[PDB]
Design a protein around this nucleic acid. Structure first.
Ligand SMILES: [Zn+2]
Ligand SMILES: [Zn+2]
Lengths: 359, 359
DNA sequence: ATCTGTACATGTACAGAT
DNA sequence: ATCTGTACATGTACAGAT
DNA sequence: ATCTGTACATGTACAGAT
DNA sequence: ATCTGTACATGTACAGAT
């Protein structure tokens, strides 16, 4: 039933190759510029993240998420109003001049300055790329990235996310986060939290206090690992194991939301990370791989639908790494929007998903 | 039944504490001496291996296995005629004078010499410790280890194993080894084979050719990982998962073999490694954790037992990492020994294992 | 002379195409 | 199925630095 | 660069429940 | 017997400091 939809969201090798050539050229160039010659971002490191590198990119290879992560050693971290996700970054005992001293704002490290210099260097280097049609997208509020528009005949979007890497232990609001013990295990969880944690610019433009100095936690790496190692059995989806319908369900969900969101302006507040969080919670609820047999697809998909409905109705969706962070708060999303989405999803659900047959 | 046997085979944390304290003391001192007083074994590192660190040690914490591994770069391996497991170690371009100069017989690295020096150093440092009752065991032919006898009242043995470390790709005799694809998976296997391989002195005194220049592959690190990561499910034997009886069956099997070897001299060619290999192949045949339920212990045990008999019947126990290397070959164990053991095994098997019930 | 950094080699999982 | 491109891990060459 | 503070796995020991 | 919860113990990773 949903097989043909998946066969339609399935990417094509020609498109993947054609896009990745160009994307890799550009990104490598920027990485060089930022790293090689004298930047404040020297030593910055690449980390490919997002749907394309998690193998859950649908329809087209037209979105690439790339992290330029920079390690900031002695870093004092201060939570922003018990939010869980938002922090302020101070420098402990800076011994010398410090390559980020121009980005200091009062006493704290400024995300806005840093991101502006970052953006300036990217623009300058992009100007010199003569073999590819590439421009820089206008700054979007909320965005932690410098977005590039590539015309490789087709339109490809590339988010260059500026990140701060901390190698220390994760914030204490992540303690009860990442509930994968009865699913991926305790050794996997223990080894994952030994990885560094990341910080992106919040880049909110509401004018509120601090604002330009406020950072947000990122775990795109942990999520990438989880997407690549998703079974309770190590051989899941491997060449000597059984395929599950997890990633496919994720795809179907993301697609439904994409179609809906491009048909209705009332869904502007919603994004694919909401459904990603939701499917994490569904995987924690149903750890067993047999609960995700391609046998059904229909049933597990419908179950995900159901859970996300409930998330909407209760106006709750805890961050999978920060459980005191509701992504479906009234603060973030109005209940009118959520009920609207609820209605749309319900219609599509008990009407045989006609929107999948659209565009 | 077998549960009571497992109860008496279980170690006591008091004995564990008392033994480990002293063992760690001595080991640390020897390691320090090794890395410090400017030896050719400077830069040697420690790797704990064996039943104790696999939590498969039975009865008493009276045996400890420690590898002193030395990273030896730029080695050329020359197989000892189609054995798969045995090699001569030459050097590509013999780098500096290199600390291993005097251990070289032209191009080939002498094992007997390097081990003789290793041993001499260890003896000199064992002489110089007066707060522990520790001596050095007489050299066993065939043994790659300088063995220490600690008479911290209860006799403890410590094998200090001289290992060469190599970070290249594993020898091609291992290409078809480690058949864990359907059990632990392809990523686990690939990762484990990204790890270094080790070479220990064969140290036979048979008098034959290449006697003191022959090295042997060791995979004790890989085995350790496998033992502590034994399930098809990642939650196997974790706090939020279900237990299995894998390690238990290994323990019982090891115990049966120990008792039989304790009684009969006709079994001197047999070691716990035959058992370990056998159960590796068993776990590979039965990948499911539910094929190893603690409620089916007996039937699991007997199962392994039967397999062992077949390995005895067909005179074939393929090494788990080097398939072309037969452990039960005529060259290694006389047919008569391999019939004696089968007879004793069947006997104990049909009569309720009376040998378990005695000391 | 040797040492270091860059980036070319090499091997395989994932998933597309047939 | 087999074949196959990409992404990512590690190993290793060698120019150029000391 | 050698040494050291935090974190949690794996395991034993024993009592209270079932 | 069987199970389970808490106490208790060793081993191992590793960032970061000196
Ligand atoms: Zn799967
Ligand atoms: Zn287990």
């Amino acid at each position: 039933k949903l097989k043909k939809v998946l066969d339609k969201l399935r990417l094509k090798r020609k498109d993947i190759s054609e896009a990745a050539e160009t994307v890799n050229k550009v990104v490598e160039r920027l990485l060089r510029r930022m790293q090689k010659r004298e930047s404040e971002f020297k030593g910055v490191e690449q980390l490919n993240t997002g749907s394309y590198y998690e193998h859950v990119k649908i329809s087209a290879p037209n979105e690439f998420d790339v992290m330029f992560k920079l390690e900031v050693p002695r870093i004092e971290l201060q939570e922003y109003y018990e939010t869980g996700a938002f922090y302020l970054v101070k420098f402990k005992r800076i011994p010398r001049g410090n390559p980020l001293s121009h980005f200091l704002e009062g006493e704290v490290l400024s995300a806005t300055k840093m991101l502006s210099k970052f953006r300036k260097i990217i623009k300058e280097e992009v100007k010199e790329i003569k073999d590819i049609d590439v421009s820089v997208e206008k700054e979007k509020p909320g965005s932690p990235a410098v977005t590039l528009l590539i015309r490789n005949p087709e339109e490809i979007s590339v988010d260059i996310i500026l990140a701060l890497e901390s190698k220390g232990s994760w914030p204490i609001s992540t303690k009860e986060g990442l509930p994968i013990q009865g699913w991926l295990g305790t050794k996997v969880r223990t080894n994952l939290r030994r990885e560094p944690f990341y910080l992106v610019p919040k880049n909110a433009k509401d004018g509120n206090s601090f604002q330009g100095e406020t950072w947000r936690l990122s775990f795109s790496h942990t999520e990438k690992y989880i997407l690549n190692n998703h079974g309770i059995e190590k051989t899941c989806c491997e060449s000597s194991g059984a395929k599950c319908c997890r990633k496919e369900c994720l795809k179907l969900m993301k697609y439904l939301l994409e179609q809906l969101k491009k048909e209705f302006q009332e869904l502007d507040a919603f994004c694919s990370y909401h459904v990603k969080t939701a499917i994490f919670h569904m995987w924690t609820q149903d750890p067993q791989d047999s609960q995700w047999d391609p046998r059904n697809l229909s049933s597990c998909f419908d179950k995900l639908l159901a859970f996300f409905l409930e998330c909407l109705r209760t106006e709750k969706l805890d961050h999978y790494f920060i459980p005191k962070f509701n992504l479906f708060s009234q603060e973030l999303i109005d209940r009118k929007s959520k009920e609207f989405l609820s209605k749309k999803i319900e219609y599509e659900r008990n009407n045989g998903f006609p929107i999948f047959d659209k565009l």
